[PDB]
Amino acid sequence: RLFKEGSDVKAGQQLYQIDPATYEADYQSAQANLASTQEQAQRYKLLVADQA
Amino acid sequence: ASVATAYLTLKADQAQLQLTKDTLGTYQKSFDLTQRSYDVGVASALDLRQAQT
């Protein structure tokens, strides 16, 4: 619990931590898929200029 | 025998010419279709060169 009680908080201030541990894992999965599809798109962007 | 052989060889080779003209027309139509598909963007230059060969 990252706040003291009875104090003023701002918008976007983090209050708790709810043990990600699942969201971190499927974030790693989605980032792993992005790391391949981004390279595929970047190589095809170079190849499409010469119509290879 | 020589005259008959030469005349039959000419008679065969003219039909070979006609079939080669038909094959060339088929290949030219295939190249035109591949050129059109390259113009619209479905195929690539890698296929256009193989159609040109």
Side-chain angles (χ1 to χ4, degrees):
Chain A
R1 167 178 71 84
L2 298 169
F3 72 100
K4 74 175 303 292
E5 313 173 301
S7 44
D8 283 282
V9 288
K10 301 163 173 301
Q13 184 188 327
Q14 171 191 9
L15 304 185
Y16 297 86
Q17 188 74 256
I18 321 173
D19 188 32
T22 309
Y23 311 104
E24 183 57 56
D26 62 2
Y27 175 69
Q28 292 290 336
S29 166
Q31 185 89 57
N33 194 23
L34 181 60
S36 89
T37 58
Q38 187 186 225
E39 296 182 43
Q40 176 97 31
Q42 280 164 194
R43 289 188 178 111
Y44 274 32
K45 199 198 181 48
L46 291 172
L47 289 182
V48 76
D50 316 301
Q51 292 261 36
Chain B
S2 276
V3 163
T5 295
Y7 160 78
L8 288 189
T9 316
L10 182 64
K11 183 76 54 181
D13 292 8
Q14 290 181 330
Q16 301 277 99
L17 251 189
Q18 199 63 37
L19 265 75
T20 315
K21 284 181 185 177
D22 293 340
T23 292
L24 179 133
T26 295
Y27 268 129
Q28 181 65 44
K29 219 155 188 184
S30 289
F31 176 76
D32 277 332
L33 294 172
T34 310
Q35 174 73 51
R36 182 62 180 141
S37 157
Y38 174 83
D39 288 337
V40 191
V42 163
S44 64
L46 216 64
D47 293 311
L48 180 67
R49 260 80 200 186
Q50 271 180 352
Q52 200 166 321
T53 53

